[PDB]
């Protein structure tokens, strides 16, 4: 298992004929946009996001990594993929493999945060209603 | 199996925090869902019924109605959809996950400008729809999968208190004394009727099954798919109507009352038909059973609740996907749900 | 009784009515705020102020393009950090800078990932030790006896900080990845050469005071790296505090006392308002029917008036300190 | 040579063949032999176009893209194409069992994982099969490798290389693994990470 | 009667709320007991199955195995009752009475003592003695006294953890997460023999009981084996294989035989496409199921499939149950029950 194929030791592991001519080289690379889209579609499936009005944005096909945007979840997935791409582009990590760690961690954190804050929203509104009624 | 009447006493009593506004029986499991007047939804197991299986604060005002459908997809796993409409001008659509005993929210439907009074959910092929009506006098149709409206129409001058769905038709019962049959996918009104003295609380199709009012009397009605419906209002009276046949959208023609059932001392709050028998409840703290063939009261449950009975649940007997279990549920003001098993 | 109480509670009626009217906007902006907060925690741990600003601009642009509303006045601290957290963190020795506070909330809300703290001054060692008070173990990757002491800390549940994080030893890899064996009623971890029970109260921090060090890929990709470094405003604040304590200590003490007392007053008044709404909520009947509830709400209003009066009176002196502060901005800048 | 042997195994352990299935298997093995080493997307697209052109030139079939050819021995007794949905469901169930028995890892299953698990299984079914996984961190290399080795009943060996260790310990670890492979007939998957060098 | 094979379709479909972990038929009444993955136990009538007769949340994690015994304690003149024994991932075994006059699960007691999930539990009765045996992921096999409610015997037959046990007379045969069976004499706790030949962990092992009739593998081959009481056993594994083994004969506590310490695989059955999850022998037929949405009826005389129920479940088939044709106190009814991953069980009758 090699993470950085440009490192000196990893380059030796790849170019050394003792290993090259015997092992099957399987280029895992990194996640593409479609894989990120599928993972996100699984992650945010349980988040109660559809509680507001949503107007389908007008965007170009090259800006959509999912099926055509219909729901808020589609927009959230596209926003997250675009932000991760822009983060790596602007941080200028060279041609390093794009580790999906940030994307995964952000997805988990977003699920947890949205759950908690939506709960707070509903409970606060209920208490306010009861007070006014009394 | 259908020729079954509950006993005088419930098998199970379930207490909740406040008044019960709606109750629905899980279509395949011994689970009862209770929607109360404080915006909460409970899931109880009938054999472990003291501590609820699930307790959800879904809305911020009272729940006015709810409906349940178990999906039948032709390709994609099936699951139970629960639709809850409240005074918050919102309809929340949830998935029941029996594996975690939790209400997983799928989405919410927005668009009505006042209190939503009724909802209905049904499926065509792999398409699932949700119809509803509210105090804004509007009846709206949403696509389940898409999450936004599909159709809108207004059948009455007064606001619609309840609706029912059969085929591609809707009878809407108004806050007025009238009831109206409209063609669902066009909004074209087809028939009108009156006869009541006060606002209609319930209205629903009578489905044909293998009985006096549950078979087509002509091949025209057999081809149409429906001939009769039933409604009840605050005039203490239950009325069974013949549905006129349009120029088969269909082109228009009045409802004709074919049988009048009386006996309640107060407002009729629920209609439910199981085989040969009509079950109903009133704001006189009683549930009652009439014979559908002769139009007589067969059995009376007096003093079933110390408050006013709000809702009944009995299984569908006109669907191949529903097992007609010998189980009936009642729920009312006094923070009680009475479940009659066998 | 009833008329007097409702007249007194008319203020809460007005505030409650405004809150429920703003409910619609509050619900509309929730998803955008959650996205911003999650991204801010995930990506901005190792960024400076300018970089965070740029990335927030990019994220707001993406939110605009894809029709997700958000609070245009969003602030990370105001959205996620509460008064109790602020007061306890400052009491433990945290700096008053906004940058340090943001990083502090980020590192404290790292529930899933082992935090890796870069602090050239080793301030956060002191802050964390004060926060947990005791049962805090300081290990190092650069010393002998590491494995056994970490094993005991795991078994008993102490809060461990491992110093010299640039010398990370992969022998503890299974802790970084949190790859535990859920052995029936127990949770265990394989470390060193054997299986060790995880008490569940055990918490791990890795710390380095060597900026631009060397974090290997395995640890770097699996930790939440947060930088705790100084900036302009921290330097200016420290310079002014030194200037004030040297020149005029009495105003220093009065300023600190006023700030602390007003913050405590604000916390008390907030919690009192919360209690008022909860007590009115759980009435078990009409307010007139429940006389004890009427008495309770009257007493709560009296307490609120006293607290707010104290804060309002104490605040009147703070512009004097504002002018005193402006006297030394010259030294600050230079 | 590898391609030859690849084709042989598929015919030898497969069901009754048709010309269409034979050509599709040939394309699948072509993907495994030549294309798995390609890095960029343009190169993969060019390889797919090359397969179409070669087939039209010599073997005049349906879609033979990289993700359209899922040959597997996991879901059946012979080595044949499988439905994507069935394989996803099977992998999810077996992965839940794997989490319960070996190690809980809450990772999401997607199509790329299914392609990678099939090729890793292919590699670990070969005589003297060895493979080298190159890609970004936290993409699922090690855990997916462990899951495949668990499916095929291999003992997983991960050398405990750490600071203050040297080639003596590494030699001892390799010697133990070698001795167990030979004298105890222990089928072994030895995972060497670049960080262990 | 023993020639009966189930029809190609279930006689009835029974729905439950989640995955079925085990099923057992009530030995005398038309009642089926179903234990699921959430710690719940259910009793259903087989003529009115649309509403459960009863249910009980006893454990808190998944039930891993259930066994049932109807007592026959004639000398005391006591009321005989069905004892239902369940074991779970909660490191516990629970023992219940079935109260047929109330149709409820009345808990009798609980047995503690394991350090990990229990993978099998069995209950059997001597003239007036009832015992409960279990094996678990802690690698130990423990036998408790039913009436007294505390451990009688403990032993460790495998270096890996034990997955399935069966008991015949005074012997226990245990399959493990390792690929080797072991036969041990339980009263003295002395291992006697081992059976190697599987490639993957063992899912089930069961004795093959003699039938008073002729059947290929249900009759002794010598006077020694006849007097011993056992000739063959059957096991199934995750290598898609079911093996019929010839048991070695120790010197008759029994003495391990220095030259006959190994089992001899006499027949191998292949045809399942996945892990074999259950096995059961009725008459001349071996019924089994796998993680391939299918059940198979095998002819024990030749080792071939006779009939196959394909796509019987939409998920993995987890459990089978047939009646006992080698016990005078059990009527071999024309009944089969299958239960599986899809939150369903199928009952075949008549
Ligand atoms: N498909 C996925 N879904 C969710 N998380 C993943 C996925 N693939 C990898 N991960 C993350 O990466 C880690 C597992 O991958 P791993 O085999 O450890 O990669 P490596 O060991 O090569 O760095 C976990 O931390 C996990 O959360």
Numbering used by the authors:
A (entry chain A): 2890 to 3023
B (entry chain B): 139 to 213, 216 to 350, 355 to 392, 397 to 400, 405 to 494
C (entry chain A): 3291 to 3624
D (entry chain A): 2623 to 2682, 2686 to 2822
E (entry chain C): 139 to 351, 354 to 392, 397 to 494
List sentences from the manuscript.
Cytoplasmic dynein-1 (dynein) is the main minus-end-directed microtubule motor responsible for transporting vesicles, protein complexes, RNAs, organelles, and viruses along microtubules. Dynein is autoinhibited and undergoes conformational changes to form an active complex that consists of one or two dynein dimers, the dynactin complex, and activating adapter(s). Dynein function in vivo also requires Lis1, which is an essential positive regulator of dynein, as shown by genetic studies in many organisms. Lis1 is required for active dynein complexes to form, but how it enables this is unclear.
Here, we present a structure of two yeast dynein motor domains with two Lis1 dimers wedged in-between. Importantly, the Chi conformation is not a consequence of the E2488Q substitution in dynein, or the use of ATP-vanadate in the sample: we also observed Chi in a data set collected from a sample containing wild-type dynein monomer, ATP, and Lis1. The AAA5 and AAA6 Chi-specific interactions involve residues on Lis1’s β-propeller that are different from those involved in all previously characterized Lis1–dynein and Lis1–Lis1 contacts. To disrupt the Chi-specific interactions, we mutated Asn213 in Lis1 to Ala (Lis1N213A), Trp288 to Asp (Lis1W288D), or both (Lis1N213A W288D) in the endogenous locus of yeast Lis1 (PAC1; GeneID: 854443). On the basis of our structure, we introduced F3446A in AAA5 and E3867A in AAA6 (Dyn1F3446A E3867A). Although we did not build the side chain for E3867 in our model owing to the lower resolution of that part of the map, this residue is a good candidate for mediating the interaction between dynein and Lis1-N213.
